[PDB]
């Protein structure tokens, strides 16, 4: 799920 939560930090944070 990092693939999506982490990718979300890589894209939003």
Curated annotation (Swiss-Prot):
The organism's place on the tree of life at top rank: Eukaryota
Listed name of the protein: Neuropeptide Y
Tyrosine amide modifications at: 13
């Amino acid at each position: 799920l990092r693939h999506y939560l982490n990718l979300l930090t890589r894209q939003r944070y």
